[PDB]
């Protein structure tokens, strides 16, 4: 997060850290959607252009964290992947279309004040809140610069209109993506940055007071570049795949 602010304690309890066992480094963000399921970007696990192809035995899920680097004893919970699922049609070759994976944890995790899952939108929720001008919130331990937080950062950002998104890049934007960020004019900054991918884009419902994850941090070009925006996976468009792997 570039131009974000320090998260308050317990502000994002669904916020999960994706951590490399060896060498021990942060890979990406992710979110907790249940007690055994974690939602992240597929590009966090698999990206052939960069020889990246992480396995289940390769990583650790750390939930309940505030601090980037300390091991928060008695607060945070570290778990093991029982299995990883990438969307059969994730497009790494062209545009990172369908950048979404599900992780099944080796054991259910218990909820505390620091650990609590986020809701997944239902069709009418996505309809009323996934609108241009409406702000969503991203959190992450990623670069604060186009360098590292000591604590979880937040930034609130507006969703931008499809046309403006399409005209700011050369990449082919699909119906499974939405972009978010301020216009150079609005002259407000903030953006995800390296380290932040796979974390959640979330909105609070004005009807029932809940937090809904609407996007996943996917791709962008630079951090907090003018006229460029963040691309996020459209979680409701992929909802039916998500239910599929969870019941099956």
């Amino acid at each position: 997060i570039v131009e974000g602010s320090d998260a308050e304690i317990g502000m994002s309890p669904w916020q999960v850290m994706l951590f490399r066992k060896s060498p021990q480094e942060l890979l990406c963000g992710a979110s907790l959607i249940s007690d055994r399921w974690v939602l992240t970007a597929a590009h966090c696990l698999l990206y052939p252009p960069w020889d990246k192809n992480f396995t289940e035995n390769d990583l650790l899920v750390r939930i309940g964290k505030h601090s980037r680097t300390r091991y928060e004893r008695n607060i945070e919970k570290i778990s093991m992947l029982e299995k990883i699922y990438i969307h059969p049609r994730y497009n790494w070759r062209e545009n990172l279309d369908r950048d979404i994976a599900l992780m099944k944890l080796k054991k259910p995790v218990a909820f505390s004040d620091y650990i609590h899952p986020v809701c997944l939108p239902d069709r009418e929720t996505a309809a009323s809140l996934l609108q241009a001008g409406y702000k969503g919130r991203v959190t992450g331990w990623g670069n604060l610069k186009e360098g590292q937080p000591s604590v979880l950062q937040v930034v609130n950002l507006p969703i931008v209109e499809r046309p403006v998104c399409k005209d700011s890049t050369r990449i082919r934007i699909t119906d499974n993506m939405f972009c978010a960020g301020y216009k150079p004019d609005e002259g407000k900054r903030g953006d995800a940055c390296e380290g932040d991918s796979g974390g959640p884009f979330v909105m609070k419902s004005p009807f029932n007071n809940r937090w809904y994850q609407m996007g996943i941090v996917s791709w962008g070009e630079g951090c907090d570049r003018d006229g460029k925006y963040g691309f996020y996976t459209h979680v409701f468009r992929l909802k039916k795949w998500i239910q599929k792997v969870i019941d099956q």
């Binding site: 066992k21 021990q24 480094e25 650790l60 680097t69 300390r70 091991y71 570290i78 093991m80 590292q148």
Partner: peptide, 10 residues
């Protein structure tokens, strides 16, 4: 830059 995690968890 990370502090040591328990081996319990590896």
């Amino acid at each position: 830059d990370f502090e040591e995690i328990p081996g319990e968890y590896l």
